Structure 1
Amino acid sequence: ASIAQARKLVEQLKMEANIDRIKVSKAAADLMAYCEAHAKEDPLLTPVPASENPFR
């Protein structure tokens, strides 16, 4: 009952514990590299020409 629900959770946590983890440095480096690489086509960040904007 409650014991059964606990078993259901008891099994679940163990499964979510056997995973491979990567150092935060590599993830941060990848994130910043992607953000810097795709920072030249964002109209919000960089103002586009006035004639280009359909709303103008």
Structure 2
Amino acid sequence: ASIAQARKLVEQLKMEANIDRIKVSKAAADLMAYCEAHAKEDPLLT
């Protein structure tokens, strides 16, 4: 029947589930890193 999207969903949910995730701590680290390393070129600050 409407299994067409039921299969799409899972196939896609499996697709997204199988990925490596960086610990939020590192992500936050990289975000700040970019900010501080580029603050000197943000005239709305520097």
User: Relative contact order (alpha carbons < 8 A, sep ≥ 6): 1 or 2 greater?
Assistant: 2
- Runs ≥4 residues deviating over 3 A: none
TM-score, normalising length: structure 1 = 0.68
Structure 2, unaligned stretches of length 5 or more? none
Q: Structure 1: any 5+ residue segments left out of the alignment?
A: 47-56
Greater Rg, structure 1 or structure 2?
1
Q: What percentage of aligned pairs have identical amino acids?
A: 100
RMSD, aligned α-carbons: 1.2
**How many residues are treated as equivalent by the alignment?**
46
